[PDB]
């Protein structure tokens, strides 16, 4: 992988109102707050 | 045609020169190249000059 | 190879008159003046040459260098005829006189 | 009665100057051609205009070789 051309990429914690916590990498830098998580989406849950 | 003939004068100070062509419109920059010069016998840098 | 320009042709390009026939009629009537004197339609307009044109009731004097055979939009006509500052002042003087008359 | 044709170019004397089995001195032009119709093989050089010339004395020889079945000229040394 090339040296210094690419944007900064780092481990970041992502949080959601549903409350699960998972480790993920992104270029965003500051912590991420999500309206909908995967485990709380109605279709993925199968409830609706 | 549009290309105008020019002389590449040896920088060795021996007066030898080459003749080539170029067009002034697209490439207004000076032409400079390392070409052989028989009288001094060495590869010396030639700069263009008027014909 | 400069292309010669007629006086009525220049006027028609400048849009002063609706048609070249009207330009010829006005020139032949003596109302139009070139260099402040009566002139025939055959006369040639020249760059930096005064055109003491008389249109309607207000005089104009232009010395424009850009002469165009082709009639242009009025936005271009403003550039086509120069309308020097003295001519502007004289035109506004004539306009004020007309307003006083009215 | 005017015609737009009547124009042609002088013929260029192409073709095979030396045919198979002919003894040629070094440097003799073997074939003059447009494009590498005959390719360069052993002891044969290809000039800039795709002419082929013997690089050594011997007997010229045509043959068919290679996956493309192209013709090759080579000087059997002698």
């Amino acid at each position: 992988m090339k040296k210094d051309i690419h944007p900064k990429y780092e481990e970041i914690t992502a949080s959601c109102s549903c409350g699960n916590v998972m480790k993920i990498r992104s270029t965003v830098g500051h912590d991420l707050n999500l309206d909908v998580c995967s485990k709380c989406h109605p279709f993925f849950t199968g409830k609706q | 045609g549009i290309r105008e003939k020019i002389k590449l004068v040896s920088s060795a100070g021996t007066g030898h020169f080459y003749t080539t062509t170029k067009n002034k419109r697209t490439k207004p920059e000076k032409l400079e190249l390392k070409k052989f010069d028989p009288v001094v016998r060495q590869h010396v840098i030639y700069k263009e000059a008027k014909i | 190879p400069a292309v010669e320009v007629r006086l009525d042709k220049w006027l028609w390009a400048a849009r002063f008159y609706k048609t070249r026939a009207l330009a010829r009629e006005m020139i032949e009537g003596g109302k139009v003046h070139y260099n402040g004197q009566r002139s025939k339609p055959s006369k040639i307009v020249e760059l930096n040459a005064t055109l003491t044109l008389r249109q309607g009731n207000d005089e104009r004097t232009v010395i424009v260098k850009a002469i165009t055979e082709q009639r242009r939009p009025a936005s271009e006509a403003a550039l086509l005829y120069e309308e020097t500052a003295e001519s502007v002042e004289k035109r506004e003087k004539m306009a004020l006189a007309r307003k006083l008359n009215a | 009665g005017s015609t737009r044709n009547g124009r042609d170019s002088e013929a260029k004397r192409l073709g095979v100057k030396r045919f198979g089995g002919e003894s040629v001195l070094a440097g003799s032009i073997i074939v003059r051609q447009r494009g590498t119709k005959f390719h360069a093989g052993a002891n044969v050089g290809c000039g800039r205009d795709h002419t082929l010339f013997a690089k050594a004395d011997g007997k010229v020889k045509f043959e068919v070789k290679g996956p493309k079945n192209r013709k090759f000229i080579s000087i059997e040394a002698e």
């Binding site: 090339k2 992502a14 998972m22 993920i24 992104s26 965003v28 999500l34 309206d35 998580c37 | - | - | -």
Partner: protein
């Protein structure tokens, strides 16, 4: 590499029992993820391509390769030798991490979401899907974005055909509807 070890432990055996494969690597695998757009409206301004490139530098985690006009098309007013979009290819740690981002955060985030078609598989096991909006991704922000934009996501899988493709994505729990 959470999806990487997901694949290594349990998706591999799930697919192996489900299709009765003799050799382990016979299970289909996801070789690469490719993101690309047609920015054909870059013929008006060159700079808008730079914004596209920066946006997906942020989205993908690597500097996009600009794409090139393959050949002239007059009907679209483009001639050969013009940049008309960008692309980014993701493999390995990045390919998994982006897949994780997709499944976890992106696929919830599309408005009016009713599913993702199962008919989008090409026919040789490689899946394709189109993303209309970029705000769905966490990295891109709504306030500083320039214009509504989209992209396409292609996943390439050594899978031989459609059913092994859908089985792979189902085992990874990719939504389908």
């Amino acid at each position: 590499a959470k999806l990487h070890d997901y694949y290594k432990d349990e998706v591999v055996k799930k697919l192996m029992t489900e299709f009765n494969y003799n050799s382990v690597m016979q299970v289909p695998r996801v070789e690469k993820i490719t993101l690309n757009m047609g920015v054909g409206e870059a013929i008006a301004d060159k700079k808008l391509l730079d914004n596209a490139a920066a946006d997906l530098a942020a989205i993908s985690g690597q500097k996009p390769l600009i794409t090139k006009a393959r050949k002239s098309v007059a009907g679209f007013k483009i001639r050969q030798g013009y940049p008309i979009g960008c692309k980014v290819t993701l493999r390995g740690e990045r390919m998994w991490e982006f897949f994780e981002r997709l499944i976890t955060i992106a696929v919830p985030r599309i408005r009016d979401f009713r599913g993702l078609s199962a008919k989008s598989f090409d026919g040789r096991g490689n899946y394709s899907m189109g993303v209309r909006e970029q705000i769905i991704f966490p990295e891109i922000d709504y306030d500083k974005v320039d214009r509504v934009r989209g992209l396409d996501i292609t996943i390439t899988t050594t899978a031989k055909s459609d059913e092994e493709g859908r089985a792979l994505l189902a085992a990874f729990d990719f939504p389908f509807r």
